[PDB]
Amino acid sequence: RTTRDDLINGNSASCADVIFIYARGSTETGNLGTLGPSIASNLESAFGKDGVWIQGVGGAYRATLGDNALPRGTSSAAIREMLGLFQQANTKCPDATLIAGGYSQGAALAAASIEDLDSAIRDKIAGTVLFGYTKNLQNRGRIPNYPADRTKVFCKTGDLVCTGSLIVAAPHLAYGPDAEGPAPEFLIEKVRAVRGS
Template identity: 40%
Template structure:
C-alpha cells in the first residue's frame, strides 16, 4: 500500500470523530453502546448477535455500524431477547494489510464466541462486521466447524474489505443469508484500502441491516434453525422463552431451534 493511501486512510477515519456525540446520546437513552458484552455477561438468549467493529473504533462494538443494527434487532424482538456481543481485538490499522485483511486476534475471538453461542441449544445466531471487522467475519466463519456455521442464520457486513476478494461470499453461508452493504463511492468495496467519506456513513444502514437479519431469524425459526434450513434444530433449549417485550405480529410461530418457544407471539 502506498504512503498516500495510508494517509488517506488515517485522514478518513479522523473525520468520523463527530459521530461520537449522537452515539453518546443513544447510550444515555439505553441503546447499544460502543462496548457490548451481553452474551459474555448474561449467557444464552433466544437471539445472539456477534459483531466485529472496524479499525480504530473504540470499545469492542464500535459506533459506525454495529449499534444501530443491534438496536433494530432489539426493537423488533425485544431487548431482553437479544444478546449483543462485540469481538475483542486491538482494531489497529496495520492488520488491514495482512493477507486475510483481518487481525488474527479478532478472528480467534470471534470463532470462540460463535462456538460458545452454538452451544446454546435454543438460540439463533446472527453475525456481522464492519471494514476490518468484515474481513474478520469472513475468516472466523470460514474457519469454524460446520456444526457451528450451520447454526448461523444470517450475516451482514458493511464496507467489506473482502468483498472483491471473496466474490461476495462466505463459504458455508447460503447466498440468501449473507448481505454486504456498500455505500456508493466506498472504494474499500472495490478491493482497496482507500477510505473516502462514504466508508464512514454506515450508521444510516443499521435499520436495513437489522431488518435483513430479522428476516433471516424468522426463516431459521420456521425451517428448523440451521443456516440452510436443511438441518433440524435441537429440541429443548437453555435460553427459556422470550421475555414478553418482543414485537407482536411478526410471523407465525413454529418449533425449530427454539424448542417450542415462539419468536413472534404465543407458542
C-alpha cells in the same frame, strides 16, 4: 452505547432466543463502534430486551489499521478470538439462533472466522450483514463456504475498499442509515424465517 457483552455475561439458565455477534471497524471504540448500537436498538424493539443478546468482538481483537494488509485482512489472534465466541455461544446456548455482522476490518474478520469454523456451528448462523467489506472483490461478494441467501453486503458507490483497494474515502463512513433501517430488518426477517411465529 458502545460496549455490550451479553453472551459472556449471560446466564446459561436463561439463554436468549437470538444471539448477535458483531465486529467493529478499525480504530472504533468499545466492542460495537459507530454502527453496532443502532442495529441493537432495532433488534431490541422487535424481540424485546430479554429476547436477544448483543455481543461485540473484544479481547485479542485490537482493530489495528495496519492489520488490513496481512494476508487474510486481519490478525490470526483476532480470528482465534471470534472463533472462540462462536464456540462459546454454541456451548452455552445450544438452541439459540445466531446472527452476525461486521464493518470494514470487522467484515474481513467475520468472513475469515466463519470460513475456519467447524460445519456444525457455521450452519447455526441464520444471517450475516457486512458493511464496507474489505475482501468484497477478492471473495466475489461472498463469505467462503457460507450461503449467499444468508448474506447481505452493503458496499456504497465510491467506497474504495469494496473494489480491491485499502484507501478510505467519505462513502466508507456513510453506513449509518443502513444500520438504522435495512440491516436490522434483514436480520429480523432471516431469524423469523427459521424460528417462525
